[PDB]
Design a binder for this molecule. Structure first.
Ligand SMILES: [Ca+2]
Ligand SMILES: [Ca+2]
Ligand SMILES: [Ca+2]
Ligand SMILES: [Ca+2]
Ligand SMILES: [Ca+2]
Ligand SMILES: [Ca+2]
Ligand SMILES: [Ca+2]
Ligand SMILES: [Ca+2]
Ligand SMILES: [Ca+2]
Ligand SMILES: [Ca+2]
Ligand SMILES: [Ca+2]
Ligand SMILES: [Ca+2]
Ligand SMILES: [Ca+2]
Ligand SMILES: [Ca+2]
Ligand SMILES: [Ca+2]
Ligand SMILES: [Ca+2]
Lengths: 506, 4
């Protein structure tokens, strides 16, 4: 009985698997046959996909099959190799080896492509193609890969919500009749809007008025005991250049003197002229707070601020601004802040005509003396046994004074540099706005916000209104406002730009 | 006594 040898088969190609390129090639198959009665020249046979391949054992037990079809090896993943040998006497024996290999005719093609655009697919894997008469495959997301006249493959990337819980990696597998598959993976990239800077301008009018001296008179009051009105004196209020009754006093003194108000006009500093669109002090208002017995104080008092405006024909127009004050002479306790007395001035106005145009004098409020740029308030607080003083600020404006100088627009329009680009996602709104150069999604859209020279209301649809609040005197040459705004698309992409407003005077 |  002859002695069988060892039959071995080497890996089928380097990685021991038949891929889609090897599918169309002729593949060498090799191995060994050693030991037992195996001799050089012995027959080597194997059946692969129902085709027999044969060779012989060479010196050293090497055996090799020149050319096996890749298609056969792709269709048959396991086969036996049989070697027929004999011994001296002629006793036969068969030595058998078995070979397995893997078959993977797939190839993948990976892309990362912007949404809402058509893209030519470059560097597709070798042998990529559509079967038969196919000119279009539909992707998992409903996109299409289309074979064009020019032989190029083009992908129409759908728009995606890149913020939701669904992957945006599209895919499609092409299958060919020979068994090859091609999987095209298409990572759809998000798009974003592009905000473009905007330009606007506004001009604030300057206009000098010639005005007479001011005469301020306390003309009426409600409640109070021992109420008197009088032209101011050195002892009570200080002196002014007229005989109008600029002082008012009330109350039964419970320690020393009467409480009241005094108003000393600004005739000398004004030098007989007003300016349009300019905070102006018409005089100094002093609140004299003394302790008076309960119930002896006014609750309101009215002061007429009278002056004439002269035109270029020499015609004088008399003007009377009525200023109403609400007064609270509060109960006095050991609490000094609670014991303070409170004056509130009302925001009244008066309109007058000069040279065929109307102008409106408006009460602004109280401002601390010596502080032209300080805060203006409408309520002031004075300790018992003290007096506080404030400039009484007005502003004169063209018209009926229903609105300040303003300009409007929409940041989505072309405002000098082109219209904002919205991106493929759409649903773009303004989600943040702020003065300066930095902006984030915030809670100022649709709100009035304070700039350098005015206020802005920018809404989510891009519409804005800017109005100048600053006094003309505080607007330097080349004054500019700039607000940064942030827009946001359907799935969260954001872009910022700046709304620049030129603020001039003329 | 009671002043304002
Ligand atoms: Ca291989
Ligand atoms: Ca091929
Ligand atoms: Ca032999
Ligand atoms: Ca087989
Ligand atoms: Ca193998
Ligand atoms: Ca294997
Ligand atoms: Ca998604
Ligand atoms: Ca998107
Ligand atoms: Ca987006
Ligand atoms: Ca005067
Ligand atoms: Ca006087
Ligand atoms: Ca006076
Ligand atoms: Ca008091
Ligand atoms: Ca009080
Ligand atoms: Ca404008
Ligand atoms: Ca813009």
């Amino acid at each position: 009985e002859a002695t069988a040898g060892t039959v071995t088969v080497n890996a089928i190609t380097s990685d021991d698997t038949i891929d889609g390129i090897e599918l169309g090639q002729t593949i060498s198959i090799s191995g060994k046959a050693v030991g037992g009665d195996i001799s050089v020249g012995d027959v080597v046979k194997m059946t692969i996909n129902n085709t027999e391949y044969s060779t012989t054992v060479k010196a050293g037990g090497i055996w090799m099959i020149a050319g096996v079809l890749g298609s056969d090896l792709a269709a048959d993943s396991e086969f036996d190799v049989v070697v027929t040998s004999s011994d001296a006497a002629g006793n036969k024996v068969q030595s058998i080896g078995t070979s397995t290999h893997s078959v993977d005719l797939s190839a993948e093609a990976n892309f990362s492509l912007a949404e809402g655009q058509q893209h030519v697919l470059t560097n597709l894997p070798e042998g990529f193609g559509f079967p038969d008469g196919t000119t279009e495959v539909v992707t998992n997301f409903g996109g299409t890969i289309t074979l064009g006249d020019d032989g190029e493959y083009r992908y129409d990337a759908p728009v995606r919500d890149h913020g939701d819980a669904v992957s945006d990696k599209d895919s499609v597998t092409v299958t060919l009749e020979d068994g090859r598959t091609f999987t095209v993976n298409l990572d759809i990239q998000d798009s974003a809007p592009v905000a473009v800077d905007d330009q606007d301008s506004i001009v604030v009018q300057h206009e000098e008025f010639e005005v007479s001296e001011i005469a301020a008179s306390w003309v009426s009051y409600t409640h109070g005991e021992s109420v008197t009105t009088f032209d101011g004196t050195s002892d009570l209020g200080g002196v002014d250049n007229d005989s109008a009754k600029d002082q008012i006093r009330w109350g039964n003194p419970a320690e020393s003197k009467q409480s009241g108000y005094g108003f000393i006009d600004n005739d000398s500093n004004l030098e007989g002229r007003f300016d349009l669109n300019q905070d102006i002090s018409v005089g100094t208002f002093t609140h004299y707070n003394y302790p008076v017995y309960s119930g002896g104080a006014i609750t309101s008092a009215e002061m007429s601020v009278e002056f004439s405006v002269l035109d270029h024909l020499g015609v004088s127009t008399p003007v009377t601004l009525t200023v109403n004050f609400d007064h609270n002479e509060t109960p006095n306790t050991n609490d000094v802040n609670a014991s303070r007395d409170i004056v509130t001035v009302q925001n009244t106005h008066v309109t007058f005509e000069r040279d065929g145009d109307i102008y409106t004098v408006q009460i602004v409020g109280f401002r601390e003396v010596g502080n032209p740029d300080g805060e203006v308030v409408t309520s002031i607080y004075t300790n018992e046994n003290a007096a506080t003083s404030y400039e009484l600020v007005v502003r004169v404006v063209e018209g009926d004074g229903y609105s300040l100088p303003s300009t409007e627009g929409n940041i989505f329009d072309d405002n000098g540099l082109g219209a904002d680009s919205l991106g493929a996602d759409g649903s773009v709104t303004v989600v943040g706005v702020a003065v300066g150069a930095i902006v984030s999604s915030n809670e100022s859209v649709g709100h009035s916000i304070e700039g350098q020279y005015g206020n802005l209301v920018l809404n989510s649809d891009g519409s804005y209104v800017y109005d100048v609040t600053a006094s003309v005197s505080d607007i330097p040459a080349g004054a500019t406002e700039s607000f940064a705004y942030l827009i946001q698309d359907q799935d969260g992409s954001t872009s910022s730009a700046n709304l620049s407003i030129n603020v001039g005077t003329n | 006594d009671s002043t304002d």
